[PDB]
Amino acid sequence: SEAASLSPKKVDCSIYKKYPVVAIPCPITYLPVCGSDYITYGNECHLCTESLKSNGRVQFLHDGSC
Numbered sequence: 001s002e003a004a005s006l007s008p009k010k011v012d013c014s015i016y017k018k019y020p021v022v023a024i025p026c027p028i029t030y031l032p033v034c035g036s037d038y039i040t041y042g043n044e045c046h047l048c049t050e051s052l053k054s055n056g057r058v059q060f061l062h063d064g065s066c
Helices: 044-053
Strands: 033-035 060-063
Touching: 033 044, 044 060
Parallel strands: none
Antiparallel strands: 033 060
């Protein structure tokens, strides 16, 4: 992984990992998060759904829009 600042962040996907990957209930709160795949997600729940789906392809990079 090429980065100046090696930032391996992992948001709590565990609580959502408790649900089936296709059906993960998300909060009504919108909190822009950015995945390591450089994709901005609506919140950590949505990030987690894709994170599990693509199996760590998209991990948590930083909070906020990419």
